[PDB]
Amino acid sequence: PPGPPGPPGPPGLPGPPGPPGPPGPPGP
Amino acid sequence: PGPPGPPGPPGLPGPPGPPGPPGPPGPPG
Amino acid sequence: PGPPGPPGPPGLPGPPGPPGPPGPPGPPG
């Protein structure tokens, strides 16, 4: 009969970049 | 011999993505 | 039994990255 399932695939791509960070500190 | 088995399971999710861009400028002094 | 099947497909993309860092100080007052 057929062989067993192959091994797991490789890890996926890295995730996409996150969103922009928060606004910065009040100016001087 | 028998035929080859089915394709294996999908891989794990990839790693976390990188930090997003720097935020916008803060409010004026 | 036949040989093991082909390797599985790639996983999904990883989780989106975290928010970037805070922006620069705003203009002077």
Side-chain angles (χ1 to χ4, degrees):
Chain A
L13 295 168
Chain B
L12 290 183
Chain C
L12 294 166

